[PDB]
Design a protein around this ligand. Sequence first.
Ligand SMILES: CC(C)(Sc1ccc(CCN(CCCCC2CCCCC2)C(=O)NC2CCCCC2)cc1)C(=O)O
Length: 135
Amino acid sequence: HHHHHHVAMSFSGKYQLQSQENFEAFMKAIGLPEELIQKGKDIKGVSEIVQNGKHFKFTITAGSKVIQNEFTVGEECELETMTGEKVKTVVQLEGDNKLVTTFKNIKSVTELNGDIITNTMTLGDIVFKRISKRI
Ligand SMILES: CC(C)(Sc1ccc(CCN(CCCCC2CCCCC2)C(=O)NC2CCCCC2)cc1)C(=O)O
């Protein structure tokens, strides 16, 4: 029962929305329309995470709209948000299945734990959480 062995972890896989904290507080603060907020907590969207050595891909799926972003780890690359805001940043791995990135005042800390994703964002005095699980 349960057999695995590897040095690093595989980001490659698809994950569905499970749970969330400070979603409305964060979304109202970044200035999202209340339609995208009511559908965003009511409907469970889908996520995908893809790793290609130094390259990295991420698919966001919020009910029907799909956003695809690409970046290269340790190199300056431009990332699109849910509203279409394109912002230059770099993403670093801490060697522990966890990617960290910062734009201005929004502190992203991603974490992968096998079949579970844990995403923790912090914009100023607001602290948004997202949890997803493998499909
Ligand atoms: C159901 C759905 C629609 S799925 C969904 C939606 C949004 C997120 C973002 C959260 N985020 C924080 C950081 C937010 C900025 C991020 C930059 C690159 C990709 C776009 C946004 C993030 O993914 N960080 C890193 C990023 C690329 C490298 C590894 C992960 C994640 C899943 C929902 O959650 O509503």
